[model samples]
Target: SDIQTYTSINKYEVPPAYSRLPLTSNFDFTPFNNTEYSGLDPDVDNHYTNAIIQLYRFIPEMFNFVVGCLKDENFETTLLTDLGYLFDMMERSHGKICSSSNFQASLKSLTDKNGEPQEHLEEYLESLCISESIKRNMPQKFNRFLLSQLIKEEAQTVNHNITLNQCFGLETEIRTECSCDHYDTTVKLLPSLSISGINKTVIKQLNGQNILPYIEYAMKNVTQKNSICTETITQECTVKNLPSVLSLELSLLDTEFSNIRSSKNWLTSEFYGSIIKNKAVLRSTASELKGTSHIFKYELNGYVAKITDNNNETRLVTYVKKYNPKENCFKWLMFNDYLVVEITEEEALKMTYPWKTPEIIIYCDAEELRKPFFSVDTYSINYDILFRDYFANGEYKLLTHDEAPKSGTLVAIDAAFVSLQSELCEIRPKRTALARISIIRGEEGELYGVPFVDDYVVNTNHIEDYLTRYSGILPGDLDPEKSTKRLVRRNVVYRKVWLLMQLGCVFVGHGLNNDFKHININVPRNQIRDTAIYFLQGKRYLSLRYLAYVLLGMNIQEGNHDSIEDAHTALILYKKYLHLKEKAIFEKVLNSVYEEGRAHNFKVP
Candidate 1:
């Protein structure tokens, strides 16, 4: 009796205590601390991309745009959709770690200059760039390049002309006049402004100045000797339009520089302009300011910085401002690949020396900054996902339009999980990820006990164990190419379950609380009918197999557990309990069951 015997009513047997303890120090023994914030997992070649991906995720307007494009009728698996999928997965992870492998895979498949598919990020960056010296090692180049590529992909996929200026573009007019009475003007649009040559002396002088004024000074008219005229030429640069997002790239004059002495938490820009033909036309003179002038206020959204180690190797990290709706305030979070931590606002803004240096700064519009973040559009259910079986041979019946779920409908569900990475802590338990889910209609009909949604969740992490005995998942069961099961992305499975809960359907199952928790959805207590609690005896709960045997003379889970069989059994047991209660014999049957259980030690013979 010294050794604890752990068992689950859902037919899962907890591993032996000795087996649960880690044999190696690699396992994390610390208790699970939920950050309530999602962070991207880093891969071998993707450390450089994680910061930029997170930068896009925190930008509410851009995130919403990408996610909203998922509902497009002609939605194809482009970089946009893949990015949306990654975003959705991170959102639903609920403090768990998520990876951007799919997005990176999609990116690696883009056509290069030679019309051959790119194999890696370096090649992709090279194809985009004609640059040999300033290679893919720089984050600023990747940041600007990736943004433009996304805009191009979005425009081509949606058949709409979407420009980078629409999100982060700046329209500028450069007017040059010479003493020789010759004048020239040129206008161009830029995604981000690059400012270099900031030595320690200049940094000292800019101690108290805001970022906008520096940008204005940088864009001020310059008087220099004209090569063609041999005379002084005044070149004036004026910004014609301000975009929703402002991106600034900063470089130090000296490569050995430490940090930028001055940084601002807020930025403001004013422009005198009129909206003619849906465009902002700036006026030079006060008299020509026929339309009202507007001012834009911005708060520092985030920045990407380079962290140099003792070995002189540099990597990119991002500090983002996270808004908490409950607190009605913003907090600072630093994302260094897979490691995400909260830092004080002062620490985030200081730009300390020796190790960290700001590379790119992001400022989002103040008014739109506080808007709600992106969420899955559950109202528009992708019904195709529920009907199409990735296995192509699953026996589960495809749900017809008439058979679609509705409010108050009863569904019995069961989920299976695999151990992605086991924790070493004695109390924290092993980490399990959703592997398979099956839901069956509870109503008695021709298709009663038939599964409508049977999805095997995709696993991107290196699975430690499939838990084959309990989960009924074997090797290659969750892999897309090798799986004979209906393998689907984790977000797709979650959305189906979420849509059902949103429809107010009552869920009936055995020990479904654990399933809902792993699936990261909350089903109202009123709508949940778990059979494990229904047949509770004092402090002990009867197993589903025992209940099925005692109430219906049916035995299940002889070998590997199946979600469909488990859910169907639970549904039948619930119906039996209803009938027994209706007949006023439920208490008699329950009492006899416990009495009979005492004779056989609760073991079904």
Candidate 2:
């Protein structure tokens, strides 16, 4: 039984159940949104929270073993996140799907390292669903389909085969012709099929044709044995009946399949958009279930790809769909561990695709009776679910202002420059010489470091422009010796800036990358939070004073600019950003703010 109790998620009842429909479903579902719903604009954000499916990367090696004097176990080498929980949601009432030992050693092997039973795995198994099933780690079995069945059996929470059957069952017809003397035709049932390779025979028969024919060809030609007997054996396949979820493993076995860039062969072929484009063709021949009429429209709900780098190390790449309320189609987003990026429909169909090619493709049955299959309320903010389910491996954390990890050396930097009097008596800025620079430690509580102010040589006696309007440096402040204010060479400031970054101190500034380049120091992007960028407030760049007035409701840089004060303003914004980052509804708030600005004419000032 799938008995899941709800301590936190009592209000969010289980979405409507899945049922076998007679035909395809209608596309009249509402988009997932918060109070403030802004249609997705990928240029401004990293991920669209409209229709995201959670994917968990299960680490088999990290699994804790049964403890004994010296315990040992050898389970199926093929470890997978089989997504057996989905069937349980549909069949049973929801509880523990399968025991840990039954799962970790599904008909494999186990010895007596024998400690207590591994309930830790039982807990781990409960956290995933169909979303995690398509999020498989190891390669799908090309030679066989044992793990899929095993996953269904174990996920049923039973040690024995539980026939994890669904309305997705398909009826198949096969015609066999042998050159010797045997000619036969037969019909059988199938659970899944592969879109394996593209040879000449396959290309001629299936290319530019409907996927139903492709399925038939693949069913008839999984291997040569199906076709080869007594010098010649040819089998013809036709789909007698279709099911709820159309699962196809994109075939990758072809010449140069190993080459990551090669897309000429069948596996990485640019046939995805075309393969499933024909909805009209399906209504003619494919068998329909009895009772209800199916209103059919195909949508690419899931895609699986294997990405290999130059080192030949493979990583699992998956893209789940978000319903595009604007386009009335599902938008796909790629999830490679932590890095998530939105992919366009055009980009997703290329052979030389940006990140990966399709390994597992799932087309929603789009039933009329059943609520849209896998309808994720992407904008729904379930912080506990996000932290507990989505971010399992310490991917996210919440910290108060005082507990910010970067609060240790929270420092802000600013630079002041002067114009140069050129030889032709013309006033040139001389590429903006750093005449003065200031670094202030903005850590909370006690103020630690004294402002490090330095003035360097500009080699101009003409005093073309003192730049007091913004530089906040008087001629008296530029006493170019160790005599008065800290006067040092550019190298001296370089060393100090270098040390700050080298010590991994978090940098804060209005436009920090420019300051680093002016001083010629490199800091990692992650280590620095650019207020100029994040707090643009829908503008290209908001002045420090403007941001302070808008964000903190305080006036800054009232008169001539003070580098230290400007740095402080930047630091303040940085702190606020950190506080917002800690919120579970952080993204929702940011986008809402963006929408507010847009509603108010998106004024920059």
Candidate 3:
């Protein structure tokens, strides 16, 4: 019966359909040249965090502070350090898309099974830890939780008491007066203010109104039913110390106030507290008998809002006020996941539809908003990152003890990529991601043509095709558990190449323009010696396999291509070209190569 079933299944089986691979020629591999801003790529589970991270990145004070902590050698790895690295990568990408996979992984590792902190976490991180499952389900509270954790981490790093609070905290005084003549007062320091009871109806009624008045009203009004008073009591709030950065969370259930105007003239009281007898009291003056009033002015910095579709799916987006130094003005830009577009201030402020509502609003002191934007210094080389090898696979060789990279070293490099997604448009090519990279030394000693850095990049997105024939990447080569090849994070490989470029090393490779482009790095013209362009005439470029066969008299890329082998071949071909040029016979050899190519159509025989 089993044999009869197998025979019947085999007789009715259909032939598999033919699959066509995408052409590499159709894709534009040039590096993203814009140095103004960058956007973070969203994964299946990390879109909720992307907007929040972008909001923090554009804040000048927060960015500068985090970068300062990153420069310290004694600082260990933590959420702050992860954020610093992510910020640095975003800046260096130069408007290209950067993946936040590493940061998400770090965040996931902080929690355990029961929604509690792990044993290895510090005391400050304990309260910040939430189960990985809870994080996705309860994203409404993520912004406040993340901000508090960042402040605590910053405080721990600085080991100072007053810096963080003065920068981002608010000091409020709550006073309750009962009908029985009992008076109770309390002071609270908070990172942000949560305003409740604002919904679609409230916003519609307050349309076209200035947002500062409503914010001030929310800050001062607090109602409570006190047991001591035995009745409902209206508690008034007073601002004692005004922070430089003021964050407000609006409790909007339906939609936001569309016509609410953004104002640059928001003000708050700066009260000075003094000791009166045995109690602490807030007085506005020191010399005068009566209180003297002082006001602190603030400008609108940015806001993050929620957008829901007809399907009830929600996503967070942010609009940040960026000061373009070159233009000498502020521009508002909208960040929706990986899509970044420059938008008008009017569009940023007006949320006319019920699908969109503001969640968090940020106000910064006028003086603080005018400061210059923070940029990562690309010229500075981090020697420690360059020397450290984070690869876990045991197949490839690492740099030797005596071999250290230095300035003016000749290095041949090559990279391979895999398809992350197919093309969605006729004009645009399929989305490709860097899969592997190999850097070979060409210093003419014992280490010539020896690969010192070979790493297969770890990809977070679901790969559509491995492109095995061209990229030498199998299905499991990039997976940490299944890959036998050396697997490293994209940032690890990128930082090594970035450090080499900063060290003034001259790169020699075949089609290095595309390699460096896909690698998301920009090298100077003087630092590059691309063989693909060196042997080109007019608009025609020869294949590496053909060039290797003709010039070096050796066959390469017999089947699947290897980055190390390709890099070594290009280095040898460059050496041959140099030798021929020295002997004054390069033109003769080039003419013969073209003659042979014309006869056989540039194909290896």
Candidate 4:
């Protein structure tokens, strides 16, 4: 069915069959690039080697590609932005495993959303699997295991007779409980590019022209359909609901589980999650067969494109794309070039950060006002399956650039920063917990440390608090402004700044404030190092990973995500831009080129 022709995709064929494992089965089965790959690195195993732990580890980066590829390419939302960041943290923390449950519990510390008992879930399910006369006996009734609190209170009064089958009907919300964040400097976060190296012949197969155009189309569809934005798929086809798309994809991916019964593909969580959902009714599990059986053309995009022969009209159909960036093998040079382009000085000053919801507020000398922005999160929201299938309304997510399993804590803290911590550590009471972050202190397209404050002032509350709430408070919430009154009490915003100030950490991000308005926090002019924009469109588009690819030529799975890696990436990009921004003056005289970019209508070649 998937092997059929379609007009949307640039004439690509999905694997005729899913049984071939077309996306990953052919990858060079390289051993883990662990310390063993580098004998000098000392492979003293210190825990975290479970294959199950690494399932979906690279999801963050995969999701980002899907999201960033959105039509606006500038849109952001909690589903992707927050979830992507969270996934990034997860990847860095070695992805979820049986242990992630414990970590989440520790992080939550007796909280309702913390500490999921997958063991209990597994045990209960396994008991059913073993005792059942029919393994294919679809869960007619699932045991009742829910939030500790919910089980303790309401259910205590009434004996709810439900089975795993009923579990699907009830809400299935599993929150993590770990609060340990790790930044693995062991994995180089920055780019090491050879400009001439990029132009080499070897990269032709991976060039942006061939793959990006298709990726762009997929991204537009994913974003438009997933990011809480309007559903535009109705324009081309009739599918408008993300839920329908995701459910269908889930069903498709679920088919792989049938192989598990014989192949013992337990290590594959994509299979696990799918199988867990589709217990029996083998036919339901094997309902929709898609794609070609050939290995040459696998459905890397998740869904297969098809032509429905309903009536004489011949309707064209496409399921949501399956963002499987990792083809099992460690892509040596794949996914390295994440281009970084920042808004210009004039542009930065007027830009907005893309936070779906503004949690921080700033009080600067200029009182600059910018909109909130969210991270481009269509990547994860629309990954593997459709967004609506996995994401409930009010879902928050984040993405990271690495596919390592060491970002557990970063995710916990990040989640805390937005939900629990923000709500509880509410700082309406001024305490003078001064925290400071660098205001927009970089050049137009640069993001290295600049000179001291020229337009900004000092703080009162925790800097993090100030940043988190830079939007809500009224004009005179703090101290009345005097023309010379350069300082005010900021909280959330400054915690980040204060941390940076203490570490003297340089601010590095792509069009950060451009999305702040989406978050409702207005950054001062030219504060972020918009590295994405710094790298022009041609050589490599404006994404840090792309720049890293252009520079490093080494592809890395910055996995689910690691804040430490993210912060480090910002620093690296900052250095990259700083190198170029500083040489702008010299380059002008040396190359005899006065200006570049839109100003001169002469783009960087």
Model 4 Cα shift for residue 565 (angstroms): 25
TM for candidate 1 is 0.59
Give Cα distance to truth, residue 163, candidate 2, Å.
Answer: 9.6
TM-scores for all candidates: the values are 0.59, 0.34, 0.62, 0.22
Ranking by TM-score: 3, 1, 2, 4
Model 3, 186-292: lDDT tens digits are 88777777666542334224323445445655556556654642567757666655677877776643323434323221222222333332222332334422333
Q: Using alpha carbons, what is the TM-score of model 2?
A: 0.34
Candidate 4: segments with Cα more than 4 A from true spot: 1-83, 88-280, 284-440, 444-605
User: Which sections of candidate 2 miss by over 4 Å?
Assistant: 1-138, 142-164, 175-187, 197-213, 219-232, 256-295, 324-331, 368-605
Residue 450 alpha-carbon offset, candidate 3, angstroms: 2.2
In model 3, state the lDDT of residue 39: 63
lDDT per residue (tens digit) for residues 197-297 in model 2: 55544443334333444544554442334424245455656555555455576564434243423423333211111113112123222343221433454
Flag the better candidate by TM-score, 2 or 4.
2
Better of 1 and 3 by TM-score: 3
Taking the tens digit of each residue's C-alpha lDDT, what string does model 4 give over 1-605? 33211112222222221011112101221221221111001110111111111211222333333223332211112222222233333332221111122122221222222646545445333432121121211111111232222223222222232211121122212122222352111111111000110112221233211222221121122111222234232111111111101111111112322322232211111110011121110111122323222111111212111121222111111111112234532221011001011112221111021111100111111111111112343223222111111211111212223311121111011110111123222111111222212232232333223222211222222333433342222222233442332332222232233223222233456545433322222233333445555554435344444444444453434333332333345545555556666855433432332232235343322
Q: List the residue pairs that clash in candidate 3.
A: none
Error of 3 at 356 (Å): 8.3
Give me the overall lDDT of model 1.
Answer: 0.63
